[PDB]
DNA sequence: AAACATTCGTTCACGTGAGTTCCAGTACAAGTCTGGTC
C-alpha cells in the first residue's frame, strides 16, 4: 500500500531499461522491472505502465501544461 | 333665450426601433484510434 521510490530512481530504472534494450540484454530489463514492481504500489504501477506505453490520457492538452509552466 | 353641432386638449391602446442577455451554429486545434510496410 506504500512505495519507497523517488522520481530520480524511477528515471534511472527507465534509463536502464532503454539502454539495455539498445544493447540486447533482456536480463537487465527483467531486473529493473522487478525492482520497480517490488518497490511500488498498484497506483504507481498503473501510472508507470501508462508512462512506458507513452499514453497518460490526462484530458489536459500539452499546450495547457506548457502555458501553466511559463 | 334654449338646443344641437363642432373643436380642442386629454386619454388609452397598439405598433415599431434600439439596447442587452442568452444560446446555437461555426471555425479551428489537439487528442485518440486505426492502417500499411519495412
Curated annotation (Swiss-Prot):
Compartments in which it is found: Nucleus
Which residues of the parent protein does this chain contain?
A: 139 to 208 of 911
Q: What's the protein name?
A: DNA ligase 4
Q: In which tissues is it expressed?
A: Testis, thymus, prostate and heart.
What this chain does, per the record? DNA ligase involved in DNA non-homologous end joining (NHEJ); required for double-strand break (DSB) repair and V(D)J recombination. Catalyzes the NHEJ ligation step of the broken DNA during DSB repair by resealing the DNA breaks after the gap filling is completed. Joins single-strand breaks in a double-stranded polydeoxynucleotide in an ATP-dependent reaction. LIG4 is mechanistically flexible: it can ligate nicks as well as compatible DNA overhangs alone, while in the presence of XRCC4, it can ligate ends with 2-nucleotides (nt) microhomology and 1-nt gaps.
Domain of life where this protein originates: Eukaryota
The disease this record links to the protein is: LIG4 syndrome: Characterized by immunodeficiency and developmental and growth delay. Patients display unusual facial features, microcephaly, growth and/or developmental delay, pancytopenia, and various skin abnormalities. Severe combined immunodeficiency autosomal recessive T-cell-negative/B-cell-negative/NK-cell-positive with sensitivity to ionizing radiation: A form of severe combined immunodeficiency, a genetically and clinically heterogeneous group of rare congenital disorders characterized by impairment of both humoral and cell-mediated immunity, leukopenia, and low or absent antibody levels. Patients present in infancy with recurrent, persistent infections by opportunistic organisms.
Family indicated by similarity = Belongs to the ATP-dependent DNA ligase family.
Q: How does it assemble?
A: Interacts with XRCC4; the LIG4-XRCC4 subcomplex has a 1:2 stoichiometry and XRCC4 is required for LIG4 stability. Component of the core long-range non-homologous end joining (NHEJ) complex (also named DNA-PK complex) composed of PRKDC, LIG4, XRCC4, XRCC6/Ku70, XRCC5/Ku86 and NHEJ1/XLF. Additional component of the NHEJ complex includes PAXX. Following autophosphorylation, PRKDC dissociates from DNA, leading to formation of the short-range NHEJ complex, composed of LIG4, XRCC4, XRCC6/Ku70, XRCC5/Ku86 and NHEJ1/XLF. Interacts with DCLRE1C; the interaction is direct. Interacts with APLF.
The organism of origin for this protein: Homo sapiens
Amino acid at each position: 500500500q506504500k512505495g519507497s521510490l523517488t522520481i530520480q530512481q524511477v528515471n534511472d530504472l527507465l534509463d536502464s531499461i532503454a539502454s539495455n534494450n539498445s544493447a540486447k540484454r533482456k536480463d537487465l530489463i527483467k531486473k529493473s522491472l522487478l525492482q520497480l514492481i517490488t518497490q511500488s504500489s498498484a497506483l504507481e504501477q498503473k501510472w508507470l505502465i501508462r508512462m512506458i506505453i507513452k499514453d497518460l490520457k490526462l484530458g489536459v492538452s500539452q499546450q495547457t501544461i506548457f502555458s501553466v509552466f511559463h
